[PDB]
Design a binder for this molecule. Structure first.
Ligand SMILES: *[C@@H]1O[C@H](CO)[C@@H](O[C@@H]2O[C@H](CO)[C@@H](O[C@@H]3O[C@H](CO)[C@@H](O)[C@H](O)[C@@H]3O)[C@H](O)[C@H]2NC(C)=O)[C@H](O)[C@H]1NC(C)=O
Ligand SMILES: *[C@@H]1O[C@H](CO)[C@@H](O[C@@H]2O[C@H](CO)[C@@H](O[C@@H]3O[C@H](CO)[C@@H](O)[C@H](O)[C@@H]3O)[C@H](O)[C@H]2NC(C)=O)[C@H](O)[C@H]1NC(C)=O
Ligand SMILES: *[C@@H]1O[C@H](CO)[C@@H](O[C@@H]2O[C@H](CO)[C@@H](O[C@@H]3O[C@H](CO)[C@@H](O)[C@H](O)[C@@H]3O)[C@H](O)[C@H]2NC(C)=O)[C@H](O)[C@H]1NC(C)=O
Ligand SMILES: *[C@@H]1O[C@H](CO)[C@@H](O[C@@H]2O[C@H](CO)[C@@H](O[C@@H]3O[C@H](CO)[C@@H](O)[C@H](O)[C@@H]3O)[C@H](O)[C@H]2NC(C)=O)[C@H](O)[C@H]1NC(C)=O
Ligand SMILES: *[C@@H]1O[C@H](CO)[C@@H](O[C@@H]2O[C@H](CO)[C@@H](O[C@@H]3O[C@H](CO)[C@@H](O)[C@H](O)[C@@H]3O)[C@H](O)[C@H]2NC(C)=O)[C@H](O)[C@H]1NC(C)=O
Lengths: 346, 346, 346, 346, 346
């Protein structure tokens, strides 16, 4: 009945000439390895380091005609992963690893099954900390495109070709949510074929389009910088001519808008360009700074020093205080319309 | 008397046809592996990473009829863990590992004992850093449910089935306490059977219901944000008409309630939704901000500028100061009743 | 003369029936393993993680009658630690490891010597990051008791028994000092025998009584919270009736005592109960807050508005200012006596 | 047809006298190993640690005449990296590793091809955390030069010589961008030959010239320290003679320029010398401090206490306030020209 | 000509009786191992952890008479480090490792050469994170002495003796600089021979005298705490009798000197004793606090309430303001002389 302890060593061992150092179809057509991944965990997307951690099931399917059995009755043999040191495997790697490891808890998390014609399925669990460049030109409203690319290191294009399969080449887990982002359904699958001075090597890559949850930044950044603009408008109502508190209220609201502007970039990389949260915290810094500059313009005109004109001399300091009480909720309201339309039109 | 150095190699070695790459009951019924865990250490439950560290004793019991002896007199053989590289073991893994390791101090912390009928006990010590999604909709008063699920990676459902045992499938250590949480006694034990394009794989999981200790947040968050509301009520008593200090006291209590609101989310993930500590630090931000807005309403009416009405002109600024001295401990007291009943009814 | 290259293989190898998978006195009395440790390094006692790092020399002594030689003349054989993969070793582990490793620099840091009757000394260097629960009810004046327990994993009580030796079972290095603590000389040595559903396993443990150096917390916490109480007493002297500065000095000393109360718990776990540094930073928060509340009581009575009683109307606002100038250094002084006697009586 | 399973063992194995412990041309001319690197990833350039992480492809070419075949028809043999434990390899290392590792995901990321005359190409993937000393004398405008040097450890100069190849010895990836720096195109390639008391060892090194993106520091450091200088010039306009706000505005702008000066060195090493961001934050600290010192000079002269001279007695306090209103935008403007010309001339 | 593939196995292998588990001169005089180190990298000297990272070349020279060849013509054999698993090596370790590792990039970074008489040179590259206790009684002006000690673990004094060699036992790299310290040229070389209950073990150690660069603490700690003392002297000039700003300037300069005193101990261990930066930040805290206490003494005497004495009643409040304007730059100047002479005399 061909006991299965003998059939493993009959097709892999010293007999039948199977050498694990030699690729299938040697000096012939190249090996066509097709791939698809299953993302278990996604996230911890850091921005100071500009990386993200993923946890994938890397499945590889190729054809090895030396492993094609004929006498065993069934169509597949799910095997022990101690056999995987004795068959040929493609030398796939990631061009943006930045450190990666296997999982070896209670057994090496590996899979091997061989069909009758020689089709070999090889599934391993890999934890990757993949590197992606962050384009933060409009920071709370951006759509990041972080990629992962699967190259060959030892075999060139005329020996080993990587492909995606047409039957859903990237599967995602059922309840995979992200704390700061969402993962869009459309995932690009293009080629990234590298040329070196050694040769040309195969490469396939999958783009992931991440869109931010803006609802966090409306709680910490935008609205608590919109309250302090209202504190700069409290100073336009008290006593209408001169007070020490109207400097002191314009003293204090600059302390926040300097600290909160520095506090808005506490967990960010040191990019050279200006971003969306900067030109909100800078324009709202002006409307705080122009509120103190307006009262300084009032006190400089009120403390200027007639027979009839002394009633008009207060009307030179009161007409300024009734334009600045009305026009600043028009200049702030025309910037607030100009800001969000510019960043919702992307 | 059958010396025990020979009996180990007789039942495991090249004789008797025992191959460690082949599961018990090959091409028959699937292997029924029953499991239970012992939690030594629990905790370091982070929230920026949304993970928790556990230290378990993973016990696995199955039946291997090829390991069934008959000539040895005693009922069990506690063995050396150097034997464990020569028997069949189930390829259990955790679907939410996020890195895990064995313990190999002074000996591999492993256990093996074999009964007469072939019952195999296999206990190992694993340190896990398990991932669980945090549902922080009501943050200091939530009941988190962090799980751990035990899957098979190479054998499908028709070859290997995981079960929990009915005799207390999750044991907890005697003095296992947590700094921030409590671990409830009722632990759910349900199934999580996964379907892939490779096959269907067995899965069992245990829910752990964690309940927060609210006593920490009453010391740092709630009561020091309740003192500053009383500082906003100090400004309703001094001089009753006009003072520079009543702006300056309303100046300073906004500096705290802006910093303490940002300080209340210093060790939290950046979730999009609003949580329980936000709508306490925001409503208590209003009662600070309305206290400055009330005095601005007094000074705008007091500095307005008759023959008889000038005594009533102070009564237009005194009646406001005696409603705001009484009605604000009524609006704060009706929110304080509405807040805690909403979050104790869960 | 029996050259020593042959005597190593004669007593350990395939001859003489020595099997390293079998414990001494098989199916007889249990193996009595006696232990003692030498602490090289102690410390890095974190409190957010509630752990401490130790660096021990773990010495183990047992009797192996199969290793008893008779023809070699000398009393001991200090051997190569490449031999330690060929003898029997007890499977000791620590029940609170939280990650631990050996030291393998320039040689495996191991020791082995075998007496003539078969006594085996086995000394290894281990770095442990041990877990101990912190009882922080009186935080700067507490006496912690952090333990370490040495269990067996595969052998039950009827096969292997751990003991401490009577000749100083815990040795400490000569100049071992700690930055925050002191290590007391009396060290408890009791039993911790564990019961599972697998069996009963041996356990011995050693308590370490750590006592804090209070001199750091007097420099940062206690005295800089005693200066700000004196700043709240500066406001009781200036102008005696009414000033904007007496609110503004009571404005500012609340900003410190709110920040310093939050700053006093910057490197602490989030325990639910109240500790000793809280009820010093809370009572000294009241004496700052009651100083501002006292001047608010003065200005509310001074700005109240006779023919003769107007001189007594200032004496209603001056008698309050001379009781609050004297009685507050009596209430603060009666708490300061009540505080330190409560926490020196432990 | 000479099947390739036999040709691997024929030229590497026990036959033909190939010993992997013996260098080519033994007791002859030294082995000339030529090298070139490909940089995949560059960056995470820390400054507290003074290091940088790189991810290179280290290609090594030498001549091994014992590997020179003649019967195989083709010009090269791309081999399995399991062969690399059986050939001679140069013992290259980096003199400033500070920890480094290989990449072993899905296969050891190694390359081996052997030409007909014995030319061996050996490409491996290394992640390095290389140490470079930071010269921070002018911090936001400096040009760093961080090196990497490739030494030999066991073979001296008379046995093994490292060289760079003339055909572009340092290749850079296509879209390699940096968040804070730019990598200049000209890369130095010089020698670093070391002399010890063991011998003289070969060394080659490549300088990398890094130039900072100044655009980040113009957003956080320079401009928010230029707004506070304008706040110190607001105090020169209000009431011209005496006000409590002109001290209080000079009170508050020192609080920022002390905190922002300490905040400007939050992610910097503790170097002894003075840098460019210090003498900008110190001179702008003076122009804040001299603004408070100017008003203190006004109030000391205005509160001095004639018959005719009392109108000139205000002109002694008004002429100071109209020179300090004009000359301080001349002293700040002459420093601002003197600062940037000094640091653009490098 | 004695081909070198045979000569390696002739003197190391099964022939000639060479056993790598037996030390040279067995049951004779002890093995005299002489040592010297080369320091490639030094630094990252942390103080919260109280450790430092070094990167050494550990060279060991002993005599092995079984390795003494006679037929080979040359004087030395630089060998492959794959041979090092077959010779005897001393079991040197460091008594204060705190974790350490080898360097294994592109080859194990090891060295072996054997002279004709049996002299063996053995150089390896080690990265150590060594522990040294910090004596911080005078913190910015201290001279630390951090050591490293090289013990034996398995062989006692009668079997193995460590020595330093007289020809410069500690070499330092050419351009080894430190960011915070300087390394003095005189390095002590003394003995540290340990006694245990196992036996007496050899030990040699080298002291390293580190001296701080004081230039950093003059930029952040000393001078920005000397400017705030000048802000406390601004309040002695304005209006000479009574002002709300003279409390408010003494209000604000306490906010800095409380935060900067806590900010000066942000990267320090929690030592119990008082250090040099504390008694500078405490005495300069008094001169800020006495400036507010002086003006409180002025306003208490000025607001006291004659016919002739009312001009002398201001002279009781003006003579205090002209002694405190002159004597405080005498008390601060006599402390500043007393402080630096005490800490330059060491
Ligand atoms: C792996 O996949 C590649 C690409 O799908 C296969 O290469 C292709 O092989 C076919 C026949 O084997 C080639 O067709 C031939 O084209 C030539 C002109 O070049 C002409 O004489 C005929 O029309 C003939 O059909 C095809 O060109 C070739 N394509 C490429 C890009 O190389 C390869 O055979 C597959 N290997 C295995 C083992 O499945
Ligand atoms: C491992 O556990 C599973 C589940 O308990 C066992 O499978 C069960 O095996 C029994 C008999 O071996 C099956 O009963 C049979 O049912 C068929 C109809 O399907 C009918 O002819 C009879 O009523 C007969 O009793 C049962 O259906 C089957 N259940 C499942 C879900 O497969 C299995 O035998 C156990 N294996 C070992 C080695 O203990
Ligand atoms: C390891 O240590 C244990 C405990 O010291 C030893 O067990 C003890 O062995 C003695 C004699 O071997 C026992 O004494 C006997 O007691 C029985 C009654 O139980 C009675 O017939 C006699 O009085 C006799 O002396 C003793 O009970 C037993 N104690 C325990 C707790 O088991 C053991 O022998 C030691 N093993 C080795 C290899 O040194
Ligand atoms: C590896 O490269 C080095 C450097 O290019 C080669 O060393 C050089 O070898 C040549 C001939 O083998 C030497 O030329 C000879 O010079 C002597 C005087 O020293 C004189 O008799 C002749 O003019 C003769 O041409 C050359 O000096 C020597 N240079 C050095 C620096 O050693 C070496 O041969 C190369 N090895 C291999 C295996 O390719
Ligand atoms: C390793 O070094 C040690 C110390 O340098 C050597 O030990 C010394 O060996 C010499 C002769 O081998 C001893 O001198 C003898 O002293 C005895 C009195 O003890 C006396 O009979 C003679 O004066 C004779 O010269 C010396 O005492 C001894 N010193 C110590 C501290 O043991 C050892 O020989 C060296 N081993 C090797 C293999 O080089």
């Amino acid at each position: 009945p061909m006991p299965p302890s003998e059939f493993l060593d009959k097709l892999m061992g010293k007999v039948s000439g199977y050498d694990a150092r030699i690729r299938p179809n040697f000096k012939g057509p190249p090996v066509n390895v097709t791939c698809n991944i299953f993302i278990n965990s996604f996230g911890s997307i850091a921005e100071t380091t500009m990386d993200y951690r993923v946890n994938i099931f890397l499945r590889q399917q190729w054809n090895d005609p030396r492993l094609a059995y004929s006498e065993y009755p069934d169509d597949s043999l799910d095997l022990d992963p101690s056999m995987l040191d004795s068959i040929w495997k493609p030398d796939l790697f990631f061009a943006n690893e930045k450190g990666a490891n296997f999982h070896e808890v209670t057994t090496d998390n590996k899979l091997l099954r061989i069909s009758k014609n020689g089709n070999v399925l090889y599934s391993i669990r890999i934890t990757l900390v993949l590197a992606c460049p962050m384009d933060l030109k409009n920071f709370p409203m951006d759509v990041q495109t972080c990629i992962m690319q699967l190259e060959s290191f030892g075999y060139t294009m005329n020996d080993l070709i990587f492909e995606w399969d047409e039957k859903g080449a990237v599967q995602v887990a059922d309840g995979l949510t992200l704390p700061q982002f969402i993962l869009k359904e459309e995932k690009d699958l293009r080629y990234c074929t590298k040329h070196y001075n050694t040769g040309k090597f195969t490469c396939i890559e999958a783009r992931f389009h991440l869109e931010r949850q803006m609802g966090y930044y409306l709680i910490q950044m935008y609205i608590p910088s919109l309250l302090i603009v209202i504190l700069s408008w409290v100073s336009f109502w008290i006593n209408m001519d001169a007070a020490p508190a109207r400097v002191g209220l314009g003293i204090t609201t600059v302390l926040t808008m300097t600290t909160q502007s520095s506090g808005s970039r506490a967990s960010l990389p040191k990019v050279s360009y200006v971003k969306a949260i900067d030109i909100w915290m800078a324009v709202c810094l002006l409307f705080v700074f122009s509120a103190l500059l307006e009262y300084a313009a009032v006190n400089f005109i009120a403390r200027q020093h007639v027979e009839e004109m002394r009633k008009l001399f207060i009307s030179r300091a009161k007409r300024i205080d009734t334009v600045s009480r009305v026009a600043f909720p028009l200049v702030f309201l025309i910037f607030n319309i100009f800001y969000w339309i510019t960043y919702k039109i992307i």
